[PDB]
């Protein structure tokens, strides 16, 4: 019904690459998996290629995925509102500032585009102002994830979208660390893109470990479905 969709009818290979620096600590992670937009589902495995990840794995989930929202299932009646797939194959730039409450912040820039037959997400991250005793550099986060809604509005002026949401990360003492996300997506290409009416993406994630894997790693399963328009 609209072009770009067609790239996503089957199961699509995903490549994720991140280079980061948090308070001066540098690290890289690579990830691979597959996305099925028909079901609204992603499976990804991430490996820290530089040793042991210096921040908790859960703090990077939205950066890696929250990272490939072109795999969202859009119900037929709101397929006119799917910015993410409409920007493909050329892709889009995704930028965020993520504010951890009472702590530092991540600033990220990513490019999400087709390189051949695989969808690749290449990311740069800088984090600063983190306390060495805080929930993040202290590694007090539980290894798990909650459900969140991700709110989307068009930004007519940038030919893109603005996205806001707050992540609730469970701390191992029973409290919650809030992570306020501000996001901006703009097409890499020249062509028209679909600028949406306000809606949101219902997102669920589950984190596990491959018990055969000796590297520091995260396995991520995620289900994402668009909603909010009648």
UniProtKB/Swiss-Prot annotation:
Effect of residue 202 to F: In H9; increases fluorescence at 395 nm excitation
Name of protein: Green fluorescent protein
The keyword Isomerase appears for this protein: no
Effect recorded for residue 128 to V: In EBFP2.0; shifts the excitation and emission spectra to shorter wavelengths and increases quantum yields compared to BFP
Result of changing residue 145 to C: In mut1.9; shifts fluorescence lifetime from 3.03 to 2.74 ns
Tissue: Photocytes.
Annotated consequence of substituting residue 150 to I: In Azurite; shifts the excitation and emission spectra to shorter wavelengths and increases quantum yields compared to BFP
Keyword entries, A-Z: Chromophore, Luminescence, Photoprotein
Outcome after substituting residue 30 to R: In mut1.28; shifts fluorescence lifetime from 3.03 to 2.76 ns. In mut2.2; shifts fluorescence lifetime from 3.03 to 1.94 ns. In mut3.3; shifts fluorescence lifetime from 3.03 to 1.88 ns
Taxonomic lineage from the root: Eukaryota, Metazoa, Cnidaria, Hydrozoa, Hydroidolina
Stated consequence of mutating residue 68 to L: In EYFP; leads to yellow fluorescence, folds faster and more efficiently at 37 degrees Celsius and has superior solubility and brightness
Domain of life: Eukaryota
Biotechnology comment: Green fluorescent protein has been engineered to produce a vast number of variously colored mutants, fusion proteins, and biosensors. Green fluorescent protein can be mutated to emit at different wavelengths such as blue for BFP (when Tyr-66 is replaced by His), cyan for CFP (when Tyr-66 is replaced by Trp), and yellow for YFP (when Thr-203 is replaced by Tyr). Further generation of mutants led to more stable proteins (at 37 degrees Celsius for example) with brighter fluorescence and longer fluorescence lifetimes.
Record PTM (Z)-2,3-didehydrotyrosine, positions in chain: 66
Annotated phenotype, changing residue 46 to L: In mut3.3; shifts fluorescence lifetime from 3.03 to 1.88 ns. In R10-3; matures to the red-emitting state with excitation and emission maxima at 555 and 585 nm, respectively
Cited function: Energy-transfer acceptor. Its role is to transduce the blue chemiluminescence of the protein aequorin into green fluorescent light by energy transfer. Fluoresces in vivo upon receiving energy from the Ca(2+)-activated photoprotein aequorin.
């Amino acid at each position: 019904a609209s072009k770009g969709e067609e790239l996503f009818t089957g199961v699509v290979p995903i490549l994720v690459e991140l280079d980061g620096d948090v308070n001066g600590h540098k690290f890289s992670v690579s990830g691979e998996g597959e996305g099925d937009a028909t079901y609204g589902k992603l499976t990804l495995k991430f490996i820290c290629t530089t040793g042991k990840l210096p921040v908790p794995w859960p703090t990077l989930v939205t950066t890696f995925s929250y990272g490939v929202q072109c795999f969202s299932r859009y119900p037929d009646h709101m397929k006119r509102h799917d910015f993410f797939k409409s920007a493909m194959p050329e892709g889009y730039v995704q930028e965020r500032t993520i504010f951890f409450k009472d702590d530092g912040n991540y600033k990220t820039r990513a490019e999400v585009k087709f390189e051949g037959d695989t969808l690749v997400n290449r990311i740069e991250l800088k984090g600063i102002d983190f306390k060495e005793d805080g929930n993040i550099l202290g590694h007090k986060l539980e290894y798990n994830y909650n459900s969140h809604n991700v709110y989307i509005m068009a930004d007519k002026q940038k030919n893109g979208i603005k996205v806001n949401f707050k992540i609730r990360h469970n701390i191992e003492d029973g409290s919650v660390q809030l992570a306020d996300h501000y996001q901006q997506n703009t097409p890499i290409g020249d062509g028209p893109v679909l600028l949406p009416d306000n809606h949101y993406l219902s997102t669920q994630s589950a984190l596990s470990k491959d018990p055969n894997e000796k590297r520091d790693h995260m396995v991520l399963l995620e289900f994402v479905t668009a909603a909010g328009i009648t």
